[PDB]
Design a protein around this ligand. Sequence first.
Ligand SMILES: NC(=O)c1ccc[n+]([C@@H]2O[C@H](COP(=O)([O-])OP(=O)(O)OC[C@H]3O[C@@H](n4cnc5c(N)ncnc54)[C@H](OP(=O)(O)O)[C@@H]3O)[C@@H](O)[C@H]2O)c1
Ligand SMILES: NC(=O)c1ccc[n+]([C@@H]2O[C@H](COP(=O)([O-])OP(=O)(O)OC[C@H]3O[C@@H](n4cnc5c(N)ncnc54)[C@H](OP(=O)(O)O)[C@@H]3O)[C@@H](O)[C@H]2O)c1
Ligand SMILES: C[C@@H]1O[C@H](OP(=O)(O)OP(=O)(O)OC[C@H]2O[C@@H](n3cnc4c(=O)[nH]c(N)nc43)[C@H](O)[C@@H]2O)[C@@H](O)[C@H](O)[C@@H]1O
Ligand SMILES: C[C@@H]1O[C@H](OP(=O)(O)OP(=O)(O)OC[C@H]2O[C@@H](n3cnc4c(=O)[nH]c(N)nc43)[C@H](O)[C@@H]2O)[C@@H](O)[C@H](O)[C@@H]1O
Lengths: 321, 315
Amino acid sequence: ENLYFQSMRILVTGGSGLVGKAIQKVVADGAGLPGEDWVFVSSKDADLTDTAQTRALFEKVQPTHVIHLAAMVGGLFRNIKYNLDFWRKNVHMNDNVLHSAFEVGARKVVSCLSTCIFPDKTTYPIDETMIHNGPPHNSNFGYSYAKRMIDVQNRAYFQQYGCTFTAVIPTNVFGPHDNFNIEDGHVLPGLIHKVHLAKSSGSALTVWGTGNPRRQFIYSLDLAQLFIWVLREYNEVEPIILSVGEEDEVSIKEAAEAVVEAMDFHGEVTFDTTKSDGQFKKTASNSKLRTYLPDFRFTPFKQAVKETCAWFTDNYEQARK
Amino acid sequence: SMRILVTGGSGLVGKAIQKVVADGAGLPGEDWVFVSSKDADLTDTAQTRALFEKVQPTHVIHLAAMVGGLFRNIKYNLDFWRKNVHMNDNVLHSAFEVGARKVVSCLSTCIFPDKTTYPIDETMIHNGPPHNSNFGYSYAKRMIDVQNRAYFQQYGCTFTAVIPTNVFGPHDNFNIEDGHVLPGLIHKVHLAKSSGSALTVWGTGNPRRQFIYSLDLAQLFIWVLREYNEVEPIILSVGEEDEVSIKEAAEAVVEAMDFHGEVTFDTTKSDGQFKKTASNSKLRTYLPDFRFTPFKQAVKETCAWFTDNYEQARK
Ligand SMILES: NC(=O)c1ccc[n+]([C@@H]2O[C@H](COP(=O)([O-])OP(=O)(O)OC[C@H]3O[C@@H](n4cnc5c(N)ncnc54)[C@H](OP(=O)(O)O)[C@@H]3O)[C@@H](O)[C@H]2O)c1
Ligand SMILES: NC(=O)c1ccc[n+]([C@@H]2O[C@H](COP(=O)([O-])OP(=O)(O)OC[C@H]3O[C@@H](n4cnc5c(N)ncnc54)[C@H](OP(=O)(O)O)[C@@H]3O)[C@@H](O)[C@H]2O)c1
Ligand SMILES: C[C@@H]1O[C@H](OP(=O)(O)OP(=O)(O)OC[C@H]2O[C@@H](n3cnc4c(=O)[nH]c(N)nc43)[C@H](O)[C@@H]2O)[C@@H](O)[C@H](O)[C@@H]1O
Ligand SMILES: C[C@@H]1O[C@H](OP(=O)(O)OP(=O)(O)OC[C@H]2O[C@@H](n3cnc4c(=O)[nH]c(N)nc43)[C@H](O)[C@@H]2O)[C@@H](O)[C@H](O)[C@@H]1O
């Protein structure tokens, strides 16, 4: 074999989700170099809360590389309900996946964190350094902390065994193959489904909260292309933030409007201010990711919202809803 | 009618709790059950589930954990993380599903933010990363609080914890390499008395610590199971004025044991965290009149115990 460009058997967990289908999409699209064997799995292949199944899965595949996306995910409102299930299930899934990869002897693992998890009381903009610098917002602390403990387990495997187990930190993500369930899903898909039912019913659109909170949104495909570059080129253990820039941060109100424009909605737009705004602001820096890939161009927000609404609309029956 | 399960019953703190209930602090209608790892490896779900099935615990005091001095922690943060996380999830979940009235796990003053104001209190537990020497351990104990807060918020379970400072007592782990400062310094002075060696105290001898005699802890712990109904944990420590330096601690031991040799410091060895001064103000709003056992007196009783049970003692 080649000492300098070596065979890869790559295991992607949570491969059927929003982020997972994007990587499939780009890889099937021709970003997969020769001598790379990609295996994407879902919970059908093995329930990663379970140790026996995970280990068995990890024996059957013999991955050199891991992208660990499998996690119980949800919007603000789902997290509020089940902080204990977000805590127990994700920590089991992460401990099983990291430890299986370890004893299988995998060369590298990139787990997946979130801007969600940073300290509520904070200086802005946030960055990789500040990950454990105070408690997270109380709305989603179960999930937050389970992610924080990935960073923790990463450094321990690395400090004790020299494992190149690291992670990425995406902001709020959106795109095709999302969870469009309104109750349990994120703001952008939830508004999309909402705008779809509204157009169809003659109803108003009800945007939850005040509309003033601020968010950074990354398109699943933009994120997938960085994810691919990370697995290959990036070799620190300290995680890296994958986010659109500071200047590209937006209110919930403009997000709603963007969906609206795109789906040609012409009915009333109403805000339910009784509902929770959650965390107001988690503004995050990409200066690090910039020092690596200074000339990468993110797909403009409004464009990505067009492509995502068109995807939902022409895949409405197949989508998760 | 209480059926109390004490995990880690065979450890330093556990023996202490066993000494006091037996000594008489058991109240009628309390069925005290102490266990150790031969009863069940709490890192295994199946075993943990089965213990909690046979025993039917109205209450749980959860001392069980992988524990060590600075120098063991430094080496083994991946174990310290993983093993403790497993035990605690297993115990807290079993407890929940047997439906216990109350669990009292055990945190530490170790696990507080390195970068902090002093004195440290219950409020600050998650206000920054812990020190790097024991991050694994530390984080695993914090997550107990996270998990505690999760069970109480979703199902209302009265799951809390206590935050003791450095403990010491009879039945401690006197393994010098793996154990805490005091029992290691005790083991050292004894091997020195037999050998005619100098005593080498590791570090500069300047770090500051708060020591609490297990026997004191025992009682406070016992009180907690009974009377303490906050989910937020409670610091159980000697007062802020009773903090001792390692040189003073070394001296204390040398007096008790009547050691006449030379006392020496290997300044190349880690000092760990210089200071973790903790406030017991909360505990005093409950127990204003609880007198702590003077530190020298307590040191003598451990040196006395150790010397007199050298062979049975964990060395
Ligand atoms: N979406 C965001 O806004 C966002 C932002 C930052 C970070 N992230 C992180 O990115 C990762 C991917 O998120 P996503 O948005 O793609 O979530 P998603 O679309 O809901 O997909 C979750 C994936 O995890 C799998 N999964 C869930 N529970 C499992 C279990 N018990 N065993 C095995 N597989 C299981 C799912 O498989 P099934 O199809 O079988 O259910 C699915 O493939 C997560 O780690 C998340 O924390 C997401
Ligand atoms: N000592 C201190 O300075 C200090 C300070 C603050 C807080 N604490 C906390 O106080 C608690 C008690 O500590 P300690 O000083 O008494 O420790 P210790 O003397 O080493 O005793 C540890 C206990 O845990 C049990 N144990 C360990 N691993 C186990 C496993 N896999 N399954 C079942 N049982 C297991 C041991 O049983 P075996 O006898 O079978 O090994 C033993 O009974 C711990 O939670 C510790 O974190 C200690
Ligand atoms: C990245 C994600 O961030 C999550 O916080 P967060 O950004 O508020 O997650 P979202 O649920 O995407 O955002 C909720 C914000 O958008 C408003 N909002 C308006 N309309 C809707 C709607 O139709 N659906 C939803 N869901 N919100 C809506 C809501 O009031 C709140 O300010 C974390 O809790 C998760 O852990 C997750 O990882
Ligand atoms: C309460 C305990 O606190 C621990 O920190 P910590 O107080 O430094 O734990 P110890 O190991 O008790 O203390 C180590 C301190 O005592 C000095 N020292 C001097 N002589 C000795 C000796 O003979 N043995 C040891 N071990 N130290 C010695 C050492 O340089 C350092 O300043 C945490 O890492 C644990 O998690 C644990 O829970």
